[PDB]
Amino acid sequence: AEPDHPIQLVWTDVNGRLSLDLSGAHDCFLNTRYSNYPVFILCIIGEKRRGKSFLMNYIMRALRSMEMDEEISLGADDEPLKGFKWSPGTETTTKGIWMWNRPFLLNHKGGKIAVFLLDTEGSLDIESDRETCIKLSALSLFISSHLIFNVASNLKETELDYMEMYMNMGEECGPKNLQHLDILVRDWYHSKKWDRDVARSYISREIEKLEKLNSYPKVLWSLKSNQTRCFLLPHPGKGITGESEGRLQDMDEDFQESLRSYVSKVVKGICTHIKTNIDGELLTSAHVFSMLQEFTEVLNLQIYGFSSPMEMFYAIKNQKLMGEIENEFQDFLKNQSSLTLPPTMRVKVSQKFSELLEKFMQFVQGSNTSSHDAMLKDLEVRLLEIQEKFCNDFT
Numbered sequence: 001a002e003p004d005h006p007i008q009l010v011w012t013d014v015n016g017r018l019s020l021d022l023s024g025a026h027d028c029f030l031n032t033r034y035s036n037y038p039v040f041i042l043c044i045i046g047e048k049r050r051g052k053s054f055l056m057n058y059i060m061r062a063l064r065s066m067e068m069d070e071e072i073s074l075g076a077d078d079e080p081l082k083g084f085k086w087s088p089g090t091e092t093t094t095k096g097i098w099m100w101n102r103p104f105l106l107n108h109k110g111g112k113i114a115v116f117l118l119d120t121e122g123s124l125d126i127e128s129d130r131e132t133c134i135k136l137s138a139l140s141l142f143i144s145s146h147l148i149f150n151v152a153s154n155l156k157e158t159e160l161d162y163m164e165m166y167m168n169m170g171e172e173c174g175p176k177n178l179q180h181l182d183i184l185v186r187d188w189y190h191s192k193k194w195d196r197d198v199a200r201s202y203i204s205r206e207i208e209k210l211e212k213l214n215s216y217p218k219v220l221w222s223l224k225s226n227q228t229r230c231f232l233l234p235h236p237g238k239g240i241t242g243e244s245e246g247r248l249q250d251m252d253e254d255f256q257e258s259l260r261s262y263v264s265k266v267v268k269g270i271c272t273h274i275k276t277n278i279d280g281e282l283l284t285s286a287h288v289f290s291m292l293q294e295f296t297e298v299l300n301l302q303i304y305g306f307s308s309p310m311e312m313f314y315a316i317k318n319q320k321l322m323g324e325i326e327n328e329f330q331d332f333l334k335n336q337s338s339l340t341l342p343p344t345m346r347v348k349v350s351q352k353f354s355e356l357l358e359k360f361m362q363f364v365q366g367s368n369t370s371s372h373d374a375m376l377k378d379l380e381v382r383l384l385e386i387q388e389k390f391c392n393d394f395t
């Protein structure tokens, strides 16, 4: 693809593996015009269909106007919105991670900062594997020097559950290593009261709530640090939801005011959030990709098995059942008399074996026949091992 187009930096393959584009994306970071500039890396993550691409496109306008006149402008009132793909409706757009395929070059200290923008697949989409999207979000969190966590309406169990998962995908993703985080609450219920003091007061309330829980130590660390801020945008109005060119004139008045304020904060903060490497040196473009590769390999090394809560509950209970059945077998073997003749013992062990396979199937929970078969085969393998060793030793 040619410059000034989104390109897909990361995608997911059949087997849930994260794959980087080692050509186009790689070459994008290593262009010799800016490869040695310090970078600012802005990533956005969060729930699907909540205006992430839309917001990135408006930030992009501000970056281009900064590139041009060193002034922040969100464009003319009738200019339709373009850039990353953004669309109304329920169906899914962004898959994997997309980036704008050129940096925006901003003036800094007699030099330049190369600004890269990453747009991440939305969470809570049942057509994608949730673990896959957790990994994509964690990757965006790791590489970011400014992370936007786009939140629908308010912080809920869902957003805390997910950010805590993102921050556990290796020590690279822990809150102390996250240079800067915006908790950006879209569709804030109050179109008039959305400023910095409202947001800080809101987070202080939330910290009070989290102090009473065990579930979110990493998010709690983040909210208490100087590395995380909250911003609020009211609802944009029905001229922006549904069929829309995404124009400034289409926006609710209070939405446009908060949007202009927020985008300006982001842009003006760029020089204070230059990306750093592990050791705190300023990272250049020419080394972002190496970092992306290394952590993609880390993320591909483990399967966590994140699933729906009912399936994880069934997994816990069924794993407990397997262990109980194995222990029941072990106890049964330990209780046999050493004076029984070997062939009579083999029949008795064999019958208990079969009986315990039946017991597993009678108590296994859930309706996934495929999963049941795999677990039963594993139990049969463990029980056969135990049986084999007991019966060879028994004389």
Ligand SMILES: Nc1nc2c(ncn2[C@@H]2O[C@H](COP(=O)(O)OP(=O)(O)O)[C@@H](O)[C@H]2O)c(=O)[nH]1
Residues within 6 Å of the ligand: 047, 048, 049, 050, 051, 052, 053, 054, 055, 085, 086, 087, 088, 089, 093, 094, 122, 186, 187, 233, 234, 235, 236, 240, 241, 242, 244, 246
């Ligand atoms: N409710 C609401 N809708 C928005 C907002 N910003 C943009 N939209 C609309 O939401 C739809 C999806 O936007 P998009 O950027 O593609 O969402 P994404 O899937 O998170 O990237 C589009 O119709 C946007 O015009 C917002 O703050 N609140």
Ligand SMILES: [Mg+2]
Residues within 6 Å of the ligand: 177, 178, 179, 276
């Ligand atoms: Mg860091």
